[PDB]
C-alpha cells in the first residue's frame, strides 16, 4: 500500500453498524476483495487502485479501517453471527457497551462520553499519521447513532482539527418512526451543523417510497433498505477510492459543495437502483433520474435551486455522450440566484463500475430544497415540544427543554439561510 488519503470509518448505533455489512461488501467487491476471506478475489487487478483509502492491507489480508461502536451488542451480532463475517468485522475494531441509549439522543451522548478515551486511544495507536479524516455512518432517529454520533463528530473535529469529518447520516421515516425521532434529529442536525464538514443525508422514507411507487428493491425489511443504503453511500465514495477527473479527498469533497459554512447538508441521488432498471436504461436516463426528486435519497416534494452539485459517471460511459448530455441537462437545472451559469455543476467519469451494473450515475447536491425537508422535521418537533410531549427522558438525561429549544432555533437558522439563497 501507498501512504496517504486514509479514511477511518466510524459506524455508530445499530443502524449505522448494520449498514456496514453492504457498505463494506460493496467496497470489498469493487476492489476485488472477498469480505469472507479477507483476501483478493482474483489475481486480476487494475494497475492503480486506491483500496488503501478505506481498507488496510495486513500481511494476512485486507481489513476495514473502521471502528464499530455501539452502546448495545445487537448490531455487531448481526455482522459476526448472522452475516458470519467475524474475520472482517473483528473485535479489535469494536468499541462496545451494554447499557443502551433507549432511543434518546442525550443518553447516547452521555453514555458514549465514557467510551471516548478508549476510542481516541485506538485512533492514535492504530491509525496512520497520514490519515486524512473520518467518515461517520449513523442514523439520526435513535439515541446511540444520534447522540454518540454527535459526540464523535464533535470530539474528532476538536481533537483532529486538520482532518476532515464526513457524516453519512440517515434521517428517520417521516411517516413511520419512533415518537422521539424529531427530538433526536433536531439535536443531531444541530450538532452536525456545528462540527461536521459535510453531511450527506439519507432517508428511509425516500427508499421506501421508490419500492411503494414494480421491480422490487426491497423484499425483506431492513435487510434490503440498509442493503440499498450501504450501496449508495459506497457509490458516493467512489470519487475517494478511484482515479479520474473527480478523484477527491475529504477536504476537496466538502469544498466543492459547502459554499457558506452553514450550507453543509447534501442530498445524494443514484441511478440505477435495480438490475432490471440498469439493463433497460441509458446514460441520459440515469442523469435525468438523478435530477428527478423521486430518486433523491431525501424525500422532496419537488426540485429546489442548486447551489453546488457534483455528478459522477461510473463504468462503461462514452465520454462524448457525457459531454453532450451535461450541456442539455445544465440548461434545465434550476440553480440558486447568483450561481454563475457554468459554476454550479461538476461532472466526471470513473472507469471502475459497480458490481451489479455496467453503468452508474451518482449526484451529490447542495440544494435549497433541504429547507423544505428540514421544515417538515421542524413542524414535527414543534407538534410535540409545544405540548411538552415525550420530553421527560431528555430532561432526566442531562438535556434541558431550553437546550431542546436552542437546537431547534439554530436548526431553524439553517433553514432560513438555505431559503435566502433560494430567493
Ligand X SMILES: Nc1nc2c(ncn2[C@@H]2O[C@H](COP(=O)(O)OP(=O)(O)O)[C@@H](O)[C@H]2O)c(=O)[nH]1
Under 8 Å between Cβ of 8 and 127: yes
Q: How many CB atoms lie within 10 A of CB 210?
A: 17
Nearer to ligand X, 119 or 248 (CB): 119
CA distances to 101, 182, 183, 389 from 383, in Å: 24, 10, 11, 9
Count of H-run helices and E-run strands, the chain: 16, 12
Q: CA torsion 63→65→67→68, rounded to 10°? A: -50
Nearer to ligand X, 103 or 235 (CB): 103
Binding interface with ligand X (CB under 6 A): 13-15, 18-19, 101, 103, 108, 139, 141-145, 170, 172-173, 177-178, 181, 204, 222, 225-226, 229
Look up residue 10 and give its three cell numbers. 466510524
Nearer to ligand X, 132 or 153 (CB): 153
SS3 sequence of 311-369: EEEEECCCHHHHHHHHHHHHHHCCECCCCCCCCCEEEEEECCCCCCCCEEEEEEEEECC
| Least distance to ligand X, CB of residue 389, Å | 18
| Least distance to ligand X, CB of residue 130, Å | 31
Nearer to ligand X, 218 or 334 (CB): 218
Nearer to ligand X, 19 or 415 (CB): 19
Does residue 307 sit in helix, strand or coil?
strand
Strand-pair category, 306-315 with 164-171 = unpaired
| Least distance to ligand X, CB of residue 376, Å | 15
| Least distance to ligand X, CB of residue 8, Å | 19
Nearer to ligand X, 173 or 278 (CB): 173
| Least distance to ligand X, CB of residue 290, Å | 20
Residue nearest to ligand X (CB): 142
H-run or E-run covering 306: strand 306-315
| Least distance to ligand X, CB of residue 363, Å | 20
Under 8 Å between Cβ of 150 and 167: no
Nearer to ligand X, 141 or 354 (CB): 141
CA distances to 117, 170, 380 from 12, in Å: 16, 11, 25
Nearer to ligand X, 147 or 304 (CB): 147
| Least distance to ligand X, CB of residue 202, Å | 7
| Least distance to ligand X, CB of residue 139, Å | 4
Q: CA 274, CA 394: separation in Å to the nearest integer?
A: 41
Which residues touch 197 (CB under 8 Å, ≥6 apart)?
A: 133, 157, 164, 165, 166, 250, 251, 254, 258, 264
Nearer to ligand X, 134 or 227 (CB): 227
DSSP per-residue letters across 185-230? HHHHHHHHHHH-SEEEEEEHHHHHHHHH----S-SSTTTTHHHHHH
Under 8 Å between Cβ of 194 and 154: yes
| Least distance to ligand X, CB of residue 180, Å | 9
Amino acid at each position: 500500500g501507498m501512504p496517504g488519503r486514509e479514511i477511518l470509518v466510524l459506524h455508530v448505533g445499530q443502524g449505522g453498524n448494520q449498514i456496514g455489512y453492504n457498505f463494506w461488501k460493496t467496497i470489498c467487491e469493487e476492489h476485488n476483495i472477498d469480505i469472507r476471506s479477507n483476501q483478493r478475489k482474483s489475481v486480476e487487478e487494475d494497475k492503480v487502485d486506491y483500496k488503501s483509502v478505506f481498507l488496510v492491507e495486513a500481511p494476512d489480508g485486507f481489513h476495514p479501517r473502521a471502528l464499530f461502536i455501539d452502546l448495545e451488542p445487537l448490531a455487531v451480532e448481526f455482522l459476526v453471527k448472522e452475516m458470519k463475517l467475524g474475520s472482517f468485522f473483528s473485535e479489535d475494531l469494536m468499541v462496545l457497551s451494554y447499557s443502551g441509549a433507549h432511543n434518546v439522543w442525550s443518553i447516547g451522548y452521555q453514555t458514549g462520553k465514557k467510551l471516548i478515551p478508549v476510542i481516541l486511544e485506538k485512533i492514535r495507536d492504530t491509525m496512520p499519521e497520514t490519515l486524512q479524516g473520518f467518515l461517520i455512518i449513523h442514523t439520526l432517529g435513535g439515541g446511540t447513532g444520534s447522540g454518540f454520533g454527535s459526540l464523535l463528530t464533535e470530539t474528532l473535529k476538536k481533537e483532529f482539527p486538520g482532518k476532515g469529518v464526513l457524516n453519512f447520516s440517515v434521517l428517520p421515516s417521516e411517516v413511520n418512526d419512533v415518537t422521539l425521532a424529531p427530538y433526536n434529529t433536531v439535536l443531531s442536525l444541530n450538532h452536525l451543523s456545528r462540527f461536521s464538514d459535510l453531511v450527506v443525508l439519507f432517508d428511509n422514507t425516500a427508499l421506501i417510497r421508490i419500492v411503494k411507487d414494480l421491480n422490487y428493491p426491497v423484499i425483506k425489511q431492513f435487510s434490503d433498505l440498509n442493503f440499498l443504503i450501504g450501496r449508495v453511500m459506497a457509490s458516493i465514495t467512489a470519487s475517494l477510492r478511484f482515479p479520474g477527473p473527480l478523484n477527491m479527498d475529504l477536504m476537496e469533497m466538502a469544498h466543492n459543495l459547502v459554499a457558506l459554512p452553514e450550507t453543509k447538508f447534501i442530498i445524494p441521488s443514484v441511478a440505477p437502483l435495480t438490475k432490471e432498471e440498469s439493463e433497460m436504461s441509458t446514460e441520459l436516463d440515469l442523469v435525468e433520474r438523478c435530477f428527478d426528486p423521486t430518486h433523491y435519497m431525501v424525500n422532496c416534494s419537488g426540485q429546489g435551486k442548486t447551489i453546488s452539485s457534483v455528478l459522477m459517471f461510473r463504468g462503461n460511459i462514452a465520454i462524448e455522450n457525457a459531454f453532450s448530455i451535461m450541456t442539455d441537462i445544465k440548461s434545465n437545472v434550476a440553480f440558486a440566484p447568483g450561481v454563475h451559469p457554468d459554476l454550479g455543476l461538476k461532472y466526471g467519469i470513473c472507469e471502475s463500475a459497480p458490481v451489479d451494473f455496467d453503468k452508474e450515475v451518482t449526484l451529490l447536491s447542495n440544494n435549497t430544497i433541504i429547507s423544505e425537508v428540514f421544515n417538515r422535521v421542524l413542524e414535527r418537533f414543534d407538534s410535540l415540544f409545544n405540548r411538552d410531549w415525550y420530553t421527560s427522558d431528555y430532561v432526566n438525561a442531562g438535556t434541558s427543554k431550553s437546550n431542546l429549544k436552542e437546537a431547534r432555533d439554530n436548526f431553524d437558522r439553517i433553514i432560513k439561510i438555505y431559503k435566502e439563497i433560494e430567493g
